[PDB]
Amino acid sequence: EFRPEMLQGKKVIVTGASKGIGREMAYHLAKMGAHVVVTARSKETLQKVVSHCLELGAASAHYIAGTMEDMTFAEQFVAQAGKLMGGLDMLILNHITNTSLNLFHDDIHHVRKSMEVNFLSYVVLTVAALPMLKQSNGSIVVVSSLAGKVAYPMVAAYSASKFALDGFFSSIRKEYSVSRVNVSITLCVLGLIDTETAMKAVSGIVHMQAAPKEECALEIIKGGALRQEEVYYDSSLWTTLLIRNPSRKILEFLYSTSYNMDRF
Amino acid sequence: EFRPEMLQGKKVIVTGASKGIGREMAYHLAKMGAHVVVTARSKETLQKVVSHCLELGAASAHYIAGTMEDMTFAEQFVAQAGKLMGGLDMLILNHITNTSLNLFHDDIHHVRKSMEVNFLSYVVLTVAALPMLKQSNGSIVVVSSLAGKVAYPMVAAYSASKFALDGFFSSIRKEYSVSRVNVSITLCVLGLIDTETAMKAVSGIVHMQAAPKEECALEIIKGGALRQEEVYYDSSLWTTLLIRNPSRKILEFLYSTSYNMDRF
Ligand SMILES: NC(=O)c1ccc[n+]([C@@H]2O[C@H](COP(=O)([O-])OP(=O)(O)OC[C@H]3O[C@@H](n4cnc5c(N)ncnc54)[C@H](OP(=O)(O)O)[C@@H]3O)[C@@H](O)[C@H]2O)c1
Numbered sequence: 001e002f003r004p005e006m007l008q009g010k011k012v013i014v015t016g017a018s019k020g021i022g023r024e025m026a027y028h029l030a031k032m033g034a035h036v037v038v039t040a041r042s043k044e045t046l047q048k049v050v051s052h053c054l055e056l057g058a059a060s061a062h063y064i065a066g067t068m069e070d071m072t073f074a075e076q077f078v079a080q081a082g083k084l085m086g087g088l089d090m091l092i093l094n095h096i097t098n099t100s101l102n103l104f105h106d107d108i109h110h111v112r113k114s115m116e117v118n119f120l121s122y123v124v125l126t127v128a129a130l131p132m133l134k135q136s137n138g139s140i141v142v143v144s145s146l147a148g149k150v151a152y153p154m155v156a157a158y159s160a161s162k163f164a165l166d167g168f169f170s171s172i173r174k175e176y177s178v179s180r181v182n183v184s185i186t187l188c189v190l191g192l193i194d195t196e197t198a199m200k201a202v203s204g205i206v207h208m209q210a211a212p213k214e215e216c217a218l219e220i221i222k223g224g225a226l227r228q229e230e231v232y233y234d235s236s237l238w239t240t241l242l243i244r245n246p247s248r249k250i251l252e253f254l255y256s257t258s259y260n261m262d263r264f
Numbered sequence: 265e266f267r268p269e270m271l272q273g274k275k276v277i278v279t280g281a282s283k284g285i286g287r288e289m290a291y292h293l294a295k296m297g298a299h300v301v302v303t304a305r306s307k308e309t310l311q312k313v314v315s316h317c318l319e320l321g322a323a324s325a326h327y328i329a330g331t332m333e334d335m336t337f338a339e340q341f342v343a344q345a346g347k348l349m350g351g352l353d354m355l356i357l358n359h360i361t362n363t364s365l366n367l368f369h370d371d372i373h374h375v376r377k378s379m380e381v382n383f384l385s386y387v388v389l390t391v392a393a394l395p396m397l398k399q400s401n402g403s404i405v406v407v408s409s410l411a412g413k414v415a416y417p418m419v420a421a422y423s424a425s426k427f428a429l430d431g432f433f434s435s436i437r438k439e440y441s442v443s444r445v446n447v448s449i450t451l452c453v454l455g456l457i458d459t460e461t462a463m464k465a466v467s468g469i470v471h472m473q474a475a476p477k478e479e480c481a482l483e484i485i486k487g488g489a490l491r492q493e494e495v496y497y498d499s500s501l502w503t504t505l506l507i508r509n510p511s512r513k514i515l516e517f518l519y520s521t522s523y524n525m526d527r528f
């Protein structure tokens with residue numbers, strides 16, 4: 001069972017932590033006395049998150065600013081953050097590119113950028129962070145959505161990227177398992193959360209309950225620290241008891257001996 | 265219920281039809297006396313597929329050669345094919361970039377190219393083909409894998425792209441449904457198929473039964489023409505009765521009224 005002590009002194013990276021769910025996570029970690037490196041593009045809002053992080057009692061707090069469109073930056077960032085904290089225990093992958101609810105017409109530029117930022121940079125960051133994470137037997141935490149398990153209209157490019165995350169990360173989990181690479185991977189499936197970006201975007205289009213930004217953030221941190229494979233968090237419990245797919249876990253198992261990894 | 269007559273005189277595009285499942289589909293279509301435009305990179309193997317297509321009694325048969333890494337080409341191809349057949353009734357999306365079973369290490373180049381070819385060009389091709397497809401109330405057929413519904417080790421990049429397909433195309437289906445855009449979308453989930461590329465790649469690593477290239481090709485064509493949302497095709501029937509996810513269909517529905525499209 002979870003205890004706040006678990007994060008004490010741990011070295012954690014949070015991406016897209018200038019606002020919303022990201023920022024809330026940085027604050028939780030600050031309260032648990034962890035080492036924290038935060039990132040986003042806006043260095044003003046990032047300075048402010050760092051200050052409050054030190055206030056709340058973080059072991060240390062730093063930021064590095066830059067866009068996750070830039071794959072060179074994503075690689076360099078992880079290294080620099082590692083040197084700042086002298087190692088890495090948890091990689092919380094949270095950022096997403098500016099997106100809004102719209103019918104898809106011919107906006108290929110958006111579909112591309114969505115894969116580039118929401119998915120591809122998550123990979124680039126994982127590659128960079130893995131050596132340090134093997135060292136500490138750490139954790140990767142990937143923030144996904146209900147849109148990354150079931151289909152929604154108006155978030156097509158977004159949904160695609162969030163689906164890709166499940167495919168990739170659920171796949172390398174199986175690789176790590178048999179390679180005895182001892183890094184855990186948590187995929188967090190979130191429903192509507194009352195962040196400002198969210199509430200603006202869904203206003204007048206979608207209607208239903210939003211779950212609170214603060215509790216959601218903790219639920220994520222909880223799941224990663226307890227090395228859970230998935231965290232489900234939504235207002236409706238009917239969702240949390242239907243979003244699960246035991247069929248898939250069974251299939252992935254019946255297939256599990258039908259290949260042979262020993263060769264690697 | 266299906267009948268070969270349904271394809272008679274229809275104008276159909278098949279991608280990656282120089283070999284394997286692609287080529288088999290082009291032959292089935294030729295037998296049903298359809299118009300056929302095929303594509304891949306290799307113009308030698310493409311000439312050959314065209315000849316045999318004419319032989320089997322295609323209403324017409326042509327090829328256009330070029331790489332689907334090139335997004336300009338994917339756009340131009342659909343247009344040229346449309347002019348050749350004077351319209352378009354079915355878009356069979358089948359090609360994938362060269363891939364093999366391996367643990368993921370740091371091959372970002374591959375992950376990228378995989379999204380570029382296996383997913384992104386599918387979108388580019390859809391955008392281009394949609395005006396003609398609205399005209400004929402046609403069909404889009406998207407070739408996916410069991411790896412695009414459940415997680416496998418050693419095909420991480422591949423799985424990611426095939427997951428993305430489900431997310432994007434399952435999403436725009438819902439858009440088309442309420443926009444009264446009358447183009448059907450078939451996602452074909454395939455298990456191991458005895459194509460050469462497949463048999464070589466899995467040899468010594470994976471073990472189990474492959475389903476025959478020819479029957480698989482027809483099952484796809486069948487599903488698209490009967491405007492089915494999904495086709496499942498695998499050796500094991502235990503798969504076909506476990507791969508289904510009725511929970512998701514239920515959730516997508518309970519959510520279906522909780523947003524309001526009327527604004528678009
Ligand atoms: N909010 C919800 O109801 C909802 C629902 C389900 C799942 N989620 C998931 O939860 C996560 C966080 O959502 P949120 O609501 O907190 O979003 P948010 O408020 O918009 O925050 C996104 C963060 O990402 C950063 N960012 C945006 N573009 C970037 C770029 N190009 N490069 C680097 N950083 C960038 C932003 O900082 P800068 O713009 O200053 O760079 C910001 O700190 C997302 O992964 C989302 O998929 C959200």
Ligand SMILES: NC(=O)c1ccc[n+]([C@@H]2O[C@H](COP(=O)([O-])OP(=O)(O)OC[C@H]3O[C@@H](n4cnc5c(N)ncnc54)[C@H](OP(=O)(O)O)[C@@H]3O)[C@@H](O)[C@H]2O)c1
Nearest residue numbers: 280281282284285304305306331332409456457459461462
């Ligand atoms: N085979 C299986 O057991 C298996 C299992 C599940 C799902 N599937 C799915 O079934 C579909 C077909 O599989 P397959 O076994 O027939 O594969 P395949 O034999 O390797 O054929 C792939 C086709 O794509 C073309 N292609 C490759 N790279 C290309 C590029 N960059 N640009 C344009 N065309 C390119 C190839 O022609 P050129 O190389 O000459 O360009 C070839 O015609 C794939 O989408 C795959 O995901 C296959």
Ligand SMILES: COc1ccc(OC(C)(C)C(=O)N[C@@H]2[C@@H]3C[C@@H]4C[C@H]2C[C@@](C(N)=O)(C4)C3)cc1
Nearest residue numbers: 099145146147152153191192197198201206523
């Ligand atoms: C069509 O009906 C629906 C659409 C969307 C719905 O919320 C989801 C659970 C899918 C979700 O994750 N939405 C996110 C997404 C889209 C938008 C709102 C939210 C924040 C977001 C952002 N932070 O940029 C902007 C990114 C529910 C229902």
Ligand SMILES: COc1ccc(OC(C)(C)C(=O)N[C@@H]2[C@@H]3C[C@@H]4C[C@H]2C[C@@](C(N)=O)(C4)C3)cc1
Nearest residue numbers: 259363409410411416417455456461462465470
């Ligand atoms: C780890 O155990 C497994 C791995 C892979 C398995 O087959 C799948 C059902 C996932 C699949 O779709 N494989 C495809 C894929 C990988 C390889 C073989 C096949 C053809 C392919 C190609 N045509 O390039 C080359 C593309 C089953 C089991």
